[PDB]
Motif scaffolding. Structure first.
Motif, PDB file in Angstrom:
ATOM      1  N   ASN D 113      -2.694   6.797   3.802  1.00  0.00           N
ATOM      2  CA  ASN D 113      -1.133   7.446   4.746  1.00  0.00           C
ATOM      3  C   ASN D 113      -1.134   7.272   6.104  1.00  0.00           C
ATOM      4  O   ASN D 113      -1.016   7.188   7.303  1.00  0.00           O
TER       5      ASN D 113
ATOM      6  N   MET E  70      -4.114  -7.321  -0.951  1.00  0.00           N
ATOM      7  CA  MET E  70      -4.105  -5.384  -0.715  1.00  0.00           C
ATOM      8  C   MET E  70      -5.163  -5.498   0.374  1.00  0.00           C
ATOM      9  O   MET E  70      -6.253  -5.338  -0.087  1.00  0.00           O
ATOM     10  N   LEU E  74      -5.764   1.161   0.101  1.00  0.00           N
ATOM     11  CA  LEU E  74      -4.539   0.792  -0.879  1.00  0.00           C
ATOM     12  C   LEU E  74      -5.543   0.646  -2.040  1.00  0.00           C
ATOM     13  O   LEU E  74      -5.631   0.997  -3.237  1.00  0.00           O
ATOM     14  N   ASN E  77      -6.827   3.320  -3.755  1.00  0.00           N
ATOM     15  CA  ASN E  77      -6.332   4.295  -4.196  1.00  0.00           C
ATOM     16  C   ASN E  77      -5.767   3.108  -5.639  1.00  0.00           C
ATOM     17  O   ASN E  77      -5.397   4.522  -6.978  1.00  0.00           O
ATOM     18  N   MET E  78      -5.204   2.332  -6.270  1.00  0.00           N
ATOM     19  CA  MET E  78      -4.929   1.882  -7.120  1.00  0.00           C
ATOM     20  C   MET E  78      -6.313   1.766  -8.338  1.00  0.00           C
ATOM     21  O   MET E  78      -5.320   2.616  -9.016  1.00  0.00           O
ATOM     22  N   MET E  81      -5.839   5.808  -9.290  1.00  0.00           N
ATOM     23  CA  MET E  81      -4.200   6.212 -10.637  1.00  0.00           C
ATOM     24  C   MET E  81      -5.188   5.749 -11.703  1.00  0.00           C
ATOM     25  O   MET E  81      -4.817   6.124 -13.178  1.00  0.00           O
ATOM     26  N   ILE E  85      -4.611   7.985 -15.530  1.00  0.00           N
ATOM     27  CA  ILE E  85      -3.947   6.808 -16.870  1.00  0.00           C
ATOM     28  C   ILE E  85      -5.612   7.194 -18.029  1.00  0.00           C
ATOM     29  O   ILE E  85      -5.241   7.798 -19.086  1.00  0.00           O
TER      30      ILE E  85
ATOM     31  N   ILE F  21      -0.809  -7.420 -14.374  1.00  0.00           N
ATOM     32  CA  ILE F  21       0.214  -6.442 -14.807  1.00  0.00           C
ATOM     33  C   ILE F  21       1.340  -6.344 -13.641  1.00  0.00           C
ATOM     34  O   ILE F  21       2.835  -6.139 -13.790  1.00  0.00           O
ATOM     35  N   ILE F  22       0.281  -6.775 -12.873  1.00  0.00           N
ATOM     36  CA  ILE F  22       1.643  -6.937 -11.290  1.00  0.00           C
ATOM     37  C   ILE F  22       1.378  -8.917 -10.596  1.00  0.00           C
ATOM     38  O   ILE F  22       0.195  -8.838 -10.465  1.00  0.00           O
ATOM     39  N   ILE F  52       2.586  -2.045 -17.454  1.00  0.00           N
ATOM     40  CA  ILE F  52       1.365  -1.309 -17.855  1.00  0.00           C
ATOM     41  C   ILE F  52       1.312  -0.069 -18.793  1.00  0.00           C
ATOM     42  O   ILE F  52       0.268  -0.263 -19.470  1.00  0.00           O
ATOM     43  N   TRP F  53       2.694   0.310 -19.000  1.00  0.00           N
ATOM     44  CA  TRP F  53       2.443   1.477 -20.417  1.00  0.00           C
ATOM     45  C   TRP F  53       4.143   1.216 -21.326  1.00  0.00           C
ATOM     46  O   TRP F  53       4.958   1.170 -20.258  1.00  0.00           O
ATOM     47  N   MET F  71       1.377   9.185 -18.752  1.00  0.00           N
ATOM     48  CA  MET F  71       1.178   7.740 -18.780  1.00  0.00           C
ATOM     49  C   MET F  71       2.273   7.111 -17.846  1.00  0.00           C
ATOM     50  O   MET F  71       2.075   6.325 -16.779  1.00  0.00           O
ATOM     51  N   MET F  74       2.555   7.889 -13.640  1.00  0.00           N
ATOM     52  CA  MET F  74       1.025   7.368 -13.688  1.00  0.00           C
ATOM     53  C   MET F  74       1.728   5.772 -13.413  1.00  0.00           C
ATOM     54  O   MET F  74       0.958   5.099 -12.467  1.00  0.00           O
ATOM     55  N   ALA F  75       1.800   5.487 -14.635  1.00  0.00           N
ATOM     56  CA  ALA F  75       2.132   3.570 -14.274  1.00  0.00           C
ATOM     57  C   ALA F  75       3.508   3.525 -12.680  1.00  0.00           C
ATOM     58  O   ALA F  75       2.709   2.094 -11.923  1.00  0.00           O
ATOM     59  N   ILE F  77       3.975   4.924 -10.562  1.00  0.00           N
ATOM     60  CA  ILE F  77       3.343   4.985  -9.050  1.00  0.00           C
ATOM     61  C   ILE F  77       2.641   3.992  -8.976  1.00  0.00           C
ATOM     62  O   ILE F  77       2.319   3.283  -7.273  1.00  0.00           O
ATOM     63  N   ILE F  78       1.768   3.592  -9.525  1.00  0.00           N
ATOM     64  CA  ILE F  78       0.826   2.361  -9.628  1.00  0.00           C
ATOM     65  C   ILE F  78       1.657   1.018  -9.314  1.00  0.00           C
ATOM     66  O   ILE F  78       2.006   0.421  -7.965  1.00  0.00           O
ATOM     67  N   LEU F  81       3.484   2.023  -4.817  1.00  0.00           N
ATOM     68  CA  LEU F  81       2.957   1.553  -4.188  1.00  0.00           C
ATOM     69  C   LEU F  81       2.318  -0.256  -4.091  1.00  0.00           C
ATOM     70  O   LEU F  81       2.366  -0.631  -2.163  1.00  0.00           O
ATOM     71  N   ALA F  82       2.579  -1.052  -5.184  1.00  0.00           N
ATOM     72  CA  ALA F  82       2.469  -2.653  -4.897  1.00  0.00           C
ATOM     73  C   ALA F  82       3.448  -2.587  -4.193  1.00  0.00           C
ATOM     74  O   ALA F  82       3.634  -3.860  -3.094  1.00  0.00           O
ATOM     75  N   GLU F  84       5.648  -1.312  -2.329  1.00  0.00           N
ATOM     76  CA  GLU F  84       5.832  -0.661  -0.549  1.00  0.00           C
ATOM     77  C   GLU F  84       4.888  -1.906   0.498  1.00  0.00           C
ATOM     78  O   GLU F  84       4.927  -2.033   1.032  1.00  0.00           O
ATOM     79  N   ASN F  85       3.733  -2.540  -1.128  1.00  0.00           N
ATOM     80  CA  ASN F  85       3.027  -3.181   0.081  1.00  0.00           C
ATOM     81  C   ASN F  85       3.381  -4.070   0.554  1.00  0.00           C
ATOM     82  O   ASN F  85       3.618  -4.894   1.671  1.00  0.00           O
ATOM     83  N   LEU F 105      -2.137   9.762  -2.346  1.00  0.00           N
ATOM     84  CA  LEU F 105      -0.866   8.867  -2.659  1.00  0.00           C
ATOM     85  C   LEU F 105       0.065   8.032  -2.473  1.00  0.00           C
ATOM     86  O   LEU F 105       0.716   7.087  -1.827  1.00  0.00           O
ATOM     87  N   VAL F 106       1.020   9.761  -1.651  1.00  0.00           N
ATOM     88  CA  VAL F 106       2.813   9.676  -2.142  1.00  0.00           C
ATOM     89  C   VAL F 106       3.598  10.594  -1.117  1.00  0.00           C
ATOM     90  O   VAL F 106       1.944  11.193  -1.724  1.00  0.00           O
TER      91      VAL F 106
END
Lengths: 226, 228, 227, 235, 235, 226
Positions: D113, E70, E74, E77-78, E81, E85, F21-22, F52-53, F71, F74-75, F77-78, F81-82, F84-85, F105-106
């Motif tokens: 960022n 992407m 980024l 970064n994913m 994360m 987990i 997952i996405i 994700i979870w 858990m 954190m899911a 947050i993933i 960010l997706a 946001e992109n 990250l954030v």
């Protein structure tokens, strides 16, 4: 029964020549002394950064005071990590406590962490001053002394045996110091020491075994008390 | 127009009327009103005390060692700082709370960068939590903040007293040397030393009076200058 | 070793307007916690009413986000005072804050709570959830679930337990009957949290001498809230 | 303008004149003046070394393990970074210090960022404290920062040597000077333009090197204008 | 291999890719697979100081990044994360077996994980905790292999256990098996054991690889006892 | 303040099938809708992590609740960010605000940062819940609505048009939902909404242009109020 002391170690104590910012024999000799002292005292070390950074370089670089003092604080962190390493080789339990947060390198100073370090009887290496500009190494030494409840600061001078007049003094009052117009420390550090009943033990730090010897009252030294 | 830099030391007592409430809305709003006017001509740094919430006497009663006692005081200043910011926000004054102790959820951290950035934006700077260290007074912090922001003068608001006396003879101007020689307690010795070392002047006045801060900058009432 | 949450409102620490914290009251509290900590894993959830209230927020024209932030700093002050009082009694204790402030307090987290439980420290929970629109009661419920405490000691200032209104004393009531009867044991949010996670309340008069110790030994007048 | 992105590797020696001062004001101001001019045509990332303050030989003397030694080096780059930022601020260049290690009171933290934000603002990015990890060289960090900022070239300033030779010129009066060399030719000859890790990182991400003499007046400006003697390492 | 004892234990890094934790697409983490891994680590931790370096392929892959348009910064970064987990899941599994364990992250996230640093690694080794390394280096353009190399050097581990999903070691159907290869022999024979950067890092710091089939029951325990088919990569 | 809305987006909204997952088409469709909505509203997005979870995996892993909810955080947050992109590609000014600090990250959510994001009129993507276990996505949505002074939460359901009694209410009261024993949200989220006068707008989010349509009152939806 372990009484608490602050040792002010200026940057010059760690440097021999301009070829290296830190000299291994000088820093190891320092570490050796702290090793022995830490058996009888709870030891706080307050480091300067004059071996790396000085006020004169700040002027050359047209650097304002806020930034200049920041450079100095970074310099103390480098020295702090070097001293810690030297003490670790002697198996002395030691901790670097910084006025500036930087977790990857050092621990942060705080009421909790100081208390915790005292209970563990760690040698406390205080770095980055107060994290604020417009403070001297001596002022930080005063603050750290009060903070750790140390009644005395060992003020090592480079070449000088104690308080003179650029006649020796075995003992001198703070009052008699300011009436005589003597610059033992800057005015701020003096005031801090007076307000909180902190004494100074001024001596020649360049001499072999100097710090050990002055705690055994062995050589020439000056005490500055109320 | 063109702005010079000043530090205003505001003790906790300036924010409190009586014991029923730690912060009084009329007192704090009056203070904000004055800062609003002053911020048009000056770059303003505020250094707050916490005496309205926390005092040395309570620390004794609680058998509290000094390291912890001064930490309580620092938290007290943050509360005061956020209250003042709120009052200034209502008057549309661009303002920022800068703390000596990091606490991101509540305040911004003071630093060389953040101070410089706040000055460029011409924000009113509310300095909070002292130096983040024990064994400092509000006065000492005022001195440090003045040096740090390159403020040549600290407005030293007193609660009830018009300036510098000897008990009762009034001084218009005294030297720092002249001050401690007469055993006067203008500030603690540390703060005095800090101001002398960095050529910072004091403007001692009665802060309880209506429009006091505005008036002393226009030289309108009784006040004392302390210089070198 | 059973786990308990003690909800201590700000008023428990204050005697009079001249001082925000009273040394006798906080020392008495610490004395009780000292004894209780030998038989229980103790979590303390503090309010800040002795320092900051909703009424002052209105006077200062303070929006809720900021008002609740003031309250959270108030709890930190209280938390550090109680820790001090417990330290003088040689009780192993830690202040865990919902808001990061490393120079003053430790941060609450899954790891730090687990670590504090293993060490059997008295946990002083501070700064609520770090979020506005939470009451001290809601924080007590969250901390109870988080620490796996089955019971919250709900100290009331003046009242022996739960009544018809203030007169019939309830020996035992249900959360369902704590809304049906139009009563106000805690706010609706805290009630829901407790029911969701099977947390019981022990409502008692905390002003009385030795009140916290006595209610765990079932000695005085108290109300159970469950189901 | 459509600014192309470059990384300039500036070793500690570029900021030091002699042992009396860790940072020389003339050398650092000259550097700042060049970056000033370059930043008008390029998005500039600076990767600094700390050799003027800290080196591997001091670590040996102090019997310092590698983890700690590299930490000293990172703190040294922060000092250099703040000094260069000051020099650039006096020339009114919009600039930011981005650190691999968090230290809020002194520097901003590097992140995806923050880099993106600094690029949009077209600030000169001064990258500091390497990767925050031991076992990395200044070269390796330059490679990582190049890839991270999508810079296709690293300006590799050398102190005294004009570029890549087949052997040391100080000794053999017969050393070939390459105006261009491939990574491949450079490794079969076992030349060590950079350490093996930095080389691999550059090859993996198609980052080119522009090796030149940094001690010369206006060296950085001149090499971007193709004006002097330089080696391009590519492919 | 390394074959160590109950006091003054040898240090090892085990590279565990995301695929080791997943059975099928219905769940990102499979309890049987992760518990089996935990059981092995439990036994191994009695004789070795164990560092685990996890991948995130079970949750995140390069192919999804392309689909989502992407950029690399980024994308990586994913992935970081994802490893957090996985790290927390493995820690949970190890805690149920009463193994003293700590999750050390290259990315600061205090509410979830501890931060890796010279001090915290040293502290974890003294306490002889199983170290679960997470979020790579905190930088893009690194693979799980390169992080394994960096963690190996940082922890002074002489060997990385390189678990492969399906393959017994290093080959060229019916291929020829290598009992041992050099790093030179690794690249020179087009044998993609790790990415070039990870290879360079291992060579530079004299870290060996122990390549084996991780899908097999008790695979990690057995290769440390030299029991099955495996390959040593070394100088 | 009124013309502010919270959109609750569960994990299921971002996933098509188990292979990924996405899903790019689902998330881009969501982004397109948010783009249009952000012209007329100040938009807060509260994400779940069910793609994700989920709670069922926690049981299989013998995972205690404190860790299980971590858990899930954190899911989100993933997912955050997706999204946001996806919004960045449409040139929407957007910021990810996390209940848990993770600077690489954030950004961190706080009173100041929310205020700052509102003034800039950024789309706020709220992530990692409250940073505390024992909260649902609905409860976080309630807290973020009160925090942002949003009077309404768009409650997207996957498959159902509104509030029935399973396989129709056009307007229900909160108290009515309780008497009727309906599971609109968990009890805690309901209490939070009632306490702070937050309304719900329950609709089918699977439908094309569902979020845009429901703000224009176009399809079948349930409004919940008290």
């Amino acid at each position: 029964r372990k009484q608490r002391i602050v040792i002010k170690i200026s940057g010059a104590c760690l440097k021999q020549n301009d070829s290296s910012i830190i000299d291994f024999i000088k820093i190891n000799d320092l570490a050796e002394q702290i090793e022995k002292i830490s058996k009888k005292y709870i030891v706080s070390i307050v480091l300067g950064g004059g071996n790396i950074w000085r006020g004169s370089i700040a002027k050359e670089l047209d650097m304002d005071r806020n930034l200049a003092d920041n450079m100095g604080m970074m310099a103390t962190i480098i020295n702090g990590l070097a001293l810690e390493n030297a003490l670790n080789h002697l198996n002395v339990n030691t901790i670097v406590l910084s006025a500036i947060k930087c977790d990857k390198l050092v621990h942060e100073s705080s009421a909790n962490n100081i208390k915790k370090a005292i209970e563990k009887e760690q040698v406390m290496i205080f770095v980055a001053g107060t994290g604020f500009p417009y403070f001297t190494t001596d002022s930080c030494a005063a603050i750290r002394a009060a903070e750790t409840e140390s009644s005395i600061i060992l003020m090592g001078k480079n070449g000088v045996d104690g308080v003179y007049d650029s006649q020796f003094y075995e003992h001198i009052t703070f009052n008699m110091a300011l009436t005589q117009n003597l610059k033992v420390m800057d005015a701020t550090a003096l005031a801090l020491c007076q307000e909180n009943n902190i004494n100074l033990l001024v001596f020649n730090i360049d001499k072999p075994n100097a710090i050990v010897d002055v705690l055994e009252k062995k050589n020439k030294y000056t005490i500055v008390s109320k």
